[PDB]
Amino acid sequence: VIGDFNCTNFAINDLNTTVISEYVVDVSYGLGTYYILDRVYLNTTILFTGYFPKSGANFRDLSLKGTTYLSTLWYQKPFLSDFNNGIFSRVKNTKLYVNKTLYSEFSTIVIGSVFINNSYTIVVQPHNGVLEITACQYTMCEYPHTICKSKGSSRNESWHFDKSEPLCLFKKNFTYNVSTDWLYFHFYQERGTFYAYYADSGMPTTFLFSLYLGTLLSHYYVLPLTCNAISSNTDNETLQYWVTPLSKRQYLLKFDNRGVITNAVDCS
Ligand SMILES: *[C@@H]1O[C@H](CO)[C@@H](O[C@@H]2O[C@H](CO)[C@@H](O[C@@H]3O[C@H](CO[C@H]4O[C@H](CO)[C@@H](O)[C@H](O)[C@@H]4O)[C@@H](O)[C@H](O[C@H]4O[C@H](CO)[C@@H](O)[C@H](O)[C@@H]4O)[C@@H]3O)[C@H](O)[C@H]2NC(C)=O)[C@H](O)[C@H]1NC(C)=O
Ligand SMILES: CC(=O)N[C@H]1[C@H]([C@H](O)[C@H](O)COC(C)=O)O[C@@](O[C@H](CO)[C@@H](O)[C@@H]2O[C@@](O)(C(=O)O)C[C@H](O)[C@H]2NC(C)=O)(C(=O)O)C[C@@H]1O
Ligand SMILES: *[C@@H]1O[C@H](CO)[C@@H](O[C@@H]2O[C@H](CO)[C@@H](O)[C@H](O)[C@H]2NC(C)=O)[C@H](O)[C@H]1NC(C)=O
Ligand SMILES: *[C@@H]1O[C@H](CO)[C@@H](O)[C@H](O)[C@H]1NC(C)=O
Ligand SMILES: *[C@@H]1O[C@H](CO)[C@@H](O)[C@H](O)[C@H]1NC(C)=O
Ligand SMILES: *[C@@H]1O[C@H](CO)[C@@H](O)[C@H](O)[C@H]1NC(C)=O
Ligand SMILES: *[C@@H]1O[C@H](CO)[C@@H](O)[C@H](O)[C@H]1NC(C)=O
Ligand SMILES: *[C@@H]1O[C@H](CO)[C@@H](O)[C@H](O)[C@H]1NC(C)=O
Ligand SMILES: *[C@@H]1O[C@H](CO)[C@@H](O)[C@H](O)[C@H]1NC(C)=O
Say if strands 140-147 and 225-226 run parallel, antiparallel, or are unpaired.
Answer: parallel
The DSSP secondary structure of 15-36, one letter per residue, reads: ------EEEE---TTSTT-B--
Question: What φ, ψ does residue 100 adopt, rounded to 5°?
Answer: 60, 15
Measured in angstroms, how far is the CA atom of residue 18 from the centroid of ligand 4? 26
| CA angle centred on 132, ends 131 and 137, rounded to 5° | 155
Contact 237, 96 (CB under 8 A): yes
Please name which of 108, 90, 98 lies closest in space to residue 180, comparing C-alpha atoms.
Answer: 90
Q: Can you say whether the dihedral through the CA atoms of 177, 178, 182, 183 is positive or negative?
A: positive
Q: Is residue 130 part of a domain?
A: yes
Strand partners, 199: 184
Report the run of H or E that residue 51 belongs to, with start and end: strand 44-53
C-alpha 197 to ligand 6 mean position (Å): 30
231 pocket-lining for ligand 9 (C-beta < 6 Å): no
Note whether residue 76 is domain-resident: yes
Domains of the chain: total? 1
Question: Dmax over Cα atoms in the chain, in whole Å?
Answer: 59
Q: Residue 125: give its domain's CATH number.
A: 2.60.120.960
| Helix-, strand-, coil-residue percentages of the chain, each rounded to 5 | 0, 50, 50
> Does the N-terminal peptide bond of residue 78 adopt cis geometry, omega within 30 degrees of 0?
yes
Q: What order do you get walking across the sheet with 158-160 strand by strand? A: 65-66, 225-226, 140-147, 158-160
Ligand 9 lined by 236 (C-beta under 6 Å): yes
DSSP-derived 3-state class of residue 73: helix
Looking at ligand 7, which atom is closest to the CA of residue 158?
14
Instruction: Indicate which atom in ligand 6 lies nearest the CA of residue 43.
Output: 1
Partners of 261 in the beta sheet? 255
d(CA 196, CA 191): 14
Buried b (16+ CB within 10 A) or exposed e, 32-66: bbbbeeeeebeeeeeebebbbbbbeebbbbbbbbb
**Is residue 251 within 8 Å of residue 266, measured between CB atoms?**
yes
Mention every residue, 6+ apart, whose C-beta is less than 8 A from residue 78.
Answer: 20, 60
SS3 72: helix
Residue 4 within a domain:
no
Q: How far is the CA of 78 from the centre of ligand 2 (A)?
A: 20
CA 212 to the chain's CA centroid: 20
Q: Give the pairing of strands 21-24 and 58-61.
A: antiparallel
Kindly state whether residue 2 falls inside one of the protein's structural domains.
no
Q: Which ligand is nearest to the CA of 6?
A: 4
Residue in 254, 243, 260 with CA at minimum distance from that of residue 81: 243
Looking from the CA of residue 42, the nearest atom of ligand 6 is: 14
Structural domain includes residue 80: yes
Instruction: Report CA(157)–ligand 7 centroid distance (Å).
Output: 10
* Domain ranges, residue 214: 12-266
Q: What number of helices (H) and strands (E) belong to the chain?
A: 0, 23
C-beta 128 within 6 A of ligand 3: no
**C-alpha span between 115 and 219 (Å, rounded):** 9
What spacing in Å lies between the alpha carbon of 88 and ligand 2's midpoint?
28
Is residue 42 a part of any domain in this protein? yes
Specify the DSSP class assigned to residue 151: T
Q: Would you give the DSSP letter of residue 228? A: S
d(C-alpha 226, C-alpha 107), whole Å: 10
In a domain, 45, yes or no: yes
For 134, phi then psi, to 5°, come to: -140, 160
Residue 5 lies in a domain: no
